[PDB]
């Protein structure tokens, strides 16, 4: 006969989802400004739309997107191999390869064939094929069934072909479907441990090394994903509010008057600027503002100098003594305007040039002359018990706030400070008034010393521990305070500086008005300094690199305050303890999860439906009756569902049956069913307007086996909702096996397929001495034993034939002693072929590929390479038939023990 | 498209025998129908012979069913009619034609044909 097969399909393999990931560019020369590029493409080999997307980048021009361009690719004749995504590992399904033909008036008659695959159990082995004709009308397709069942996990193959009688075409299909295991995924946690080098750990370095996923519930040979995710944690410290710059719109003075009065006007000016722009107020304040400001401290600058004397000292008139305290509050304000707007500096340094010179006594005090004619601006200092102590640090830091900017110029300004600095120590624990120790104290901290006794009398003499206080006038006391936050500040203290600053906050102190220029110049210069340097955060900087065995290479990573990188997941497939190694500063989160295939009960199939299949061969050749059951597993009835059948191979339903059923009220088969021929109609669907929850809602219809066929593949049923096709119900029906599964031998989820033959059908006559040695002592033949059948134990899935070893006459690599018993396995389609009778002796040599259990209990399997031959008792020997199998066993027994198989 | 060029042809005795040689133009590679027609003088155009893309199912005509061999090359871009045994009623012009694999014994599927070759078989 003819295998029209034989047309050498090589069948298609390349169906990518999409392809043509290329980068062309256009450097041929353009023809009225456009370039056009030809470019050969190889078509793959899917039949179907493409969809071509093209996005051009260019220097002159930009990004353009085409429009989309297709292609379409089709054949008259041509296999789509409807595969599903994933398989669940042993379970039985039914694939559809859905045959083409768009030939306009041309019937085909086609030869279809499901290649054999180790990897599934099929009706198609390795020495027999699963072909079969079909019938394609016109214009029409046909879907033909195949079941199968996946034997091992992974990326598992599926291939078609066909091939049409009478004319030379051909087509071949080989897609690839998931083999899954049968558990469930699910995620454990392997470890959180968090991360802190600076009190964890040693040396600054903190090591922790990370266990390997501990899963005992794992599927055995699945794949397991470890993430490790590093994350670092943010921490935040509370901080004091910013005065609300409303409160602040009186400050903005136009500076007018002579050398005393011109200050008095440009301190609110400068210092509202100075904290407005360090606080960035200015949006909610008016944008606009800043500038009619910043002219008014150049108009403040530009009227000073006309009151700046010519030996380089301040006063009130040119013609008035200069004065030790003014000078030094003009270099208190112009060094704090140098950061907004500068002119000259030499003015600055040369105010400090004679702030030494000429007040500085070699004991390091500051005496005042006074001819500072406003007293209002003096603030404190004035009305003071110890005004000799006060002053020397009033000018001091005076002194420093030019420092940085009258280094080169004044290199004489180290020695006075030095100086200052000394005399204020002697008499630091011998004052008495709040105002004194607090300018004082902020005069000693500025890069300078106070001794630990000094620091004591400074933070012990804050009444309440918030707050510096004196009997006088408020402003001398919110002067004082100012200068406590700014020592504060300057030891980078911060335990003692919240309940400080909430006092001044709570004081409601918003500069301006009579005699408040050093309590306005104070309040918003040390306010500033606060929202210059503060804590908001605990510095986090983390250096943590990961050391895994599973590269060679150690990833790290730099989890700074920065925002860029807080956590950073590391996935690694491979499931090895390796090291966490974690230095730096701040806190951190370390996260080890581990994603795996739990085992746990396979009952993800028919969740929704109960299906009840059965097939009864009730009474043109062969006619059964096909029944089908289904009820919903819901509360209420469900809605519109599919019943989705395939008839086994060979067989048709009764027209008149499905006209029956189609007039049904709750039924519904479509008029395009009904009027197909009775051949090639192999797949059907039954519309059902609602199936009950409470009963089982039964039909029924015969079907005819139209064709008479050596091998009937099993039949489905297969229910769903329509709004939900994962959430099925897939049931098999075939007579003579059982629930109609495909043959097959499973232990602890590992099945290998059992639609082999039988055994090895030489007969018993046709075989001879000679070629019982020659078969027996090949290697592959690993177990020669002379069993006694003592126990047949018969079930539904396999019949089980207990053996006695009555001699071993060749051992193989399972260690039998003579008088032990082991088990041989077959399935219960060869129950009639072996013939197998109790009490009887036979002759069994097979292969080790067809050991099954574990070796203390080590089951045999009847397969297609074992062989089976009645052994007649002795006494039987004495007949004339069984002298030639006698004579002929006795010599293979004594041939094999005695002298063994030579090569 | 294809074009193709019949060789091979002449003059031959009754008796005797002679193989025709088809060059193909471009690559006949996945071309599923190579197929010989014949027309006799007086005559209409006839099949004769027609070959799978691979070369494993031919098509034989009735009048020269067991007489002739139709072979390909798909690496040489060839076509063969091995003529053997021949009859003074097989003297026709015998074109070379692809086909696309349908109907493969009849020339309503054969869209690119040859120049054709004269094979006089005399008596």
């Known amino acids: 006969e003819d295998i029209i097969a034989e047309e050498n399909i090589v069948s298609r393999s390349e169906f990518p989802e999409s392809w043509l990931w290329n980068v062309e560019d256009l450097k041929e020369p353009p023809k009225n400004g456009i370039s056009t590029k030809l470019m050969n493409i190889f078509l793959k080999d899917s039949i179907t739309t493409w969809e071509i997307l093209a996005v051009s980048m260019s220097d002159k021009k930009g990004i353009c997107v085409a429009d989309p361009f297709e292609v379409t690719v089709m054949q008259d004749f041509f296999i789509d191999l409807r595969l599903p995504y994933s398989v669940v590992r042993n379970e039985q399904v039914e694939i559809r390869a859905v045959l083409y033909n768009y030939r306009q008036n041309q019937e085909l008659k086609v030869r279809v064939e499901l290649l054999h695959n180790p990897a599934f159990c099929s009706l198609a082995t390795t020495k027999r094929r699963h072909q079969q004709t079909v019938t394609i009308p016109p214009k029409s397709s046909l879907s033909v069934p195949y079941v199968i069942v996946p034997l091992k996990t992974g990326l598992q193959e599926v291939e078609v072909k066909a091939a049409v009688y009478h004319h030379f075409i051909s087509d071949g299909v080989r897609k690839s479907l998931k083999v899954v295991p049968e558990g469930i995924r699910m995620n454990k946690t392997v470890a959180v441990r968090t991360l802190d080098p600076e009190r964890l750990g040693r040396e600054g370095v903190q090591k922790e090394d990370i266990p390997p996923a501990d899963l005992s519930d794992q599927v055995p040979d699945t794949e397991s994903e470890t993430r490790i995710l590093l994350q670092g944690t943010p921490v935040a410290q509370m901080t004091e509010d910013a005065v609300d710059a409303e409160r602040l719109k009186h400050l903005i003075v136009t500076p007018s008057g002579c050398g005393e009065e011109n200050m008095i006007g440009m301190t609110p000016t400068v210092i509202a600027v100075h904290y407005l722009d360090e606080t960035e107020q200015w949006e909610k304040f008016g944008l606009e503002k800043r500038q009619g400001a910043l002219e008014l401290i150049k108009k403040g600058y530009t009227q000073q100098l006309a009151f700046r004397q010519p030996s380089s000292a301040f006063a009130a008139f040119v013609k008035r003594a200069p004065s030790t305290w003014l000078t030094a509050y003009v270099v208190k304000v112009f060094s704090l305007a140098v950061n907004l707007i500068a002119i000259d500096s030499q003015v600055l340094c040369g105010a400090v040039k004679w702030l030494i010179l000429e007040k500085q006594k070699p004991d390091g005090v500051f005496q005042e002359d006074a001819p500072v004619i406003h007293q209002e601006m003096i603030g404190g200092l004035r009305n003071n018990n110890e005004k000799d102590m006060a002053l020397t640090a009033f000018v001091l830091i005076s002194l420093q706030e030019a420092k940085d900017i009258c280094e080169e110029q004044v290199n004489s300004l180290p020695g006075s400070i030095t100086k200052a600095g000394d005399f204020l120590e002697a008499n630091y624990m011998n004052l008495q008034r709040s105002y004194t120790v607090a300018i004082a104290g902020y005069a000693l901290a500025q890069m300078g010393r106070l001794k630990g006794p000094l620091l004591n009398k400074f933070l012990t003499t804050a009444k309440d521990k918030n707050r510096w206080e004196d009997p006088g006038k408020q402003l001398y006391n919110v002067e004082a305070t100012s200068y406590a936050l700014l020592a504060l500040l300057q030891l980078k203290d911060f335990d003692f500086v919240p309940p400080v600053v909430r006092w001044l906050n709570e004081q409601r102190y918003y500069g301006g008005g009579y005699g408040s220029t050093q309590a306005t110049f104070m309040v918003f210069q040390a306010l500033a300094q606060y929202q210059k340097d503060a804590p908001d955060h605990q510095e986090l900087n983390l250096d943590v690199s990961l050391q895994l065995p599973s590269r060679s290479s150690k990833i790290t990573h730099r989890i700074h305050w920065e925002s860029a990188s807080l956590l950073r997941s590391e996935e690694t497939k491979e499931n090895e303890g390796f090291t966490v190694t974690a230095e730096g500063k701040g806190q951190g989160t370390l996260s080890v999860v581990t994603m795996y295939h739990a085992k746990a009960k396979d009952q993800l199939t028919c969740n929704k439906f109960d299906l009840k299949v059965t097939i009864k061969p009730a009474p043109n050749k062969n006619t059964m009756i096909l029944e089908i059951c289904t009820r919903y597993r819901g509360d209420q009835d469900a809605t519109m569902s599919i019943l989705d059948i395939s008839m086994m191979t060979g067989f048709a339903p009764d027209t008149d049956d499905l006209k029956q059923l189609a007039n049904g009220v709750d039924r519904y088969i479509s008029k395009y069913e009904l009027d197909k021929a009775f051949s090639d109609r192999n797949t059907l669907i039954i519309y059902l307007d609602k199936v009950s929850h409470s009963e089982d809602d039964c039909l029924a219809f015969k079907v005819h086996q139209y064709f008479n066929v050596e091998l009937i593949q099993p039949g489905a049923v297969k229910v769903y909702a329509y709004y939900n096709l994962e959430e099925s119900c897939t049931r098999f029906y075939h007579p003579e096996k059982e629930d109609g599964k495909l043959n097959k031998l499973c232990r602890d989820e590992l099945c290998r397929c059992a639609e082999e033959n039988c055994f090895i059908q030489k007969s018993d006559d046709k075989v001879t001495l000679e070629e019982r040695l020659d078969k027996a002592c090949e290697p592959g033949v690993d177990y020669v034993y002379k069993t006694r059948l003592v126990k047949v134990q018969l079930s539904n899935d396999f019949d089980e034939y207990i053996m006695a070893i009555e001699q071993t006459i060749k051992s193989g690599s399972d260690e039998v002693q003579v008088g032990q018993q082991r088990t041989f396995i077959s399935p219960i389609k060869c129950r009639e072929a072996l013939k197998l009778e109790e009490k009887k002796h036979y002759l069994m040599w097979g292969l080790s590929s067809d050991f099954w259990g574990e070796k203390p209990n080590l089951s045999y399997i009847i397969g297609k390479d074992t062989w089976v031959e009645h052994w007649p008792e002795e006494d039987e020997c004495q007949d004339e038939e069984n002298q030639k199998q006698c004579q002929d066993l006795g010599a293979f027994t004594e041939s094999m023990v005695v002298f063994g198989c030579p090569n | 498209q294809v074009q193709l060029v019949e060789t091979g042809g002449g003059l031959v005795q009754a008796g005797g025998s002679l193989r025709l040689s088809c060059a193909a133009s471009?690559?006949?590679?996945?071309?599923?129908?190579m197929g010989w027609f014949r027309q006799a003088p007086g005559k209409e155009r006839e099949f004769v012979a027609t070959?799978?893309?691979?070369?494993?199912?031919?098509y034989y005509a009735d009048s020269v069913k067991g007489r002739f061999t139709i072979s390909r090359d798909n690496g040489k871009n060839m076509v063969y009619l091995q003529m053997h045994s021949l009859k003074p009623e097989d003297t026709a012009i015998y074109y070379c034609?692809?086909?696309?694999?349908?109907?493969?014994?009849?020339?309503?599927?054969?869209?690119?044909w040859g120049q054709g070759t004269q094979v006089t078989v005399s008596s």
């Open positions: 070959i799978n893309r691979s070369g494993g199912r031919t």
């Open positions: 471009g690559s006949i590679f996945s071309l599923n129908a």
């Open positions: 034609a692809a086909g696309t694999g349908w109907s493969p014994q009849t020339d309503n599927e054969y869209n690119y």
